[PDB]
């Protein structure tokens, strides 16, 4: 669904667009890992 794509793009770019809520328990770990990966990528670039 478009909600997952919007959430991923917002997390990567840190824009706040969309209000995606991954209520699935398994999806929560994936979301945290994706946020950590985005933070690591940004820090490495800087």
Partner 1 sequence: GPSFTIGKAIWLLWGLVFNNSVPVQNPKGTTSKIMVSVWAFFAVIFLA
List interacting residues with partner 1 (CB under 8 A): 6, 9-10, 13-18, 42, 45-46
41 in Cβ contact with 11 (< 8 Å): no
Q: For the chain, how many residues are written?
A: 46
5 or 33, CB closer to partner 1? 5
Query: Considering only CA atoms, which of 14, 32, 37, 13 is closest in space to residue 22?
Result: 32
| Nearest-approach distance from CB 24 to partner 1, in angstroms | 24
| Nearest-approach distance from CB 22 to partner 1, in angstroms | 19
26 or 46, CB closer to partner 1? 46
17 in Cβ contact with 9 (< 8 Å): yes
């Amino acid at each position: 669904l478009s909600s997952a794509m919007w959430f991923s793009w917002g997390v990567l770019l840190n824009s706040g667009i969309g209000e995606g809520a991954p209520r699935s328990f398994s999806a929560r770990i994936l979301g945290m890992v994706w946020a950590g990966f985005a933070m690591i990528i940004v820090a490495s670039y800087t």
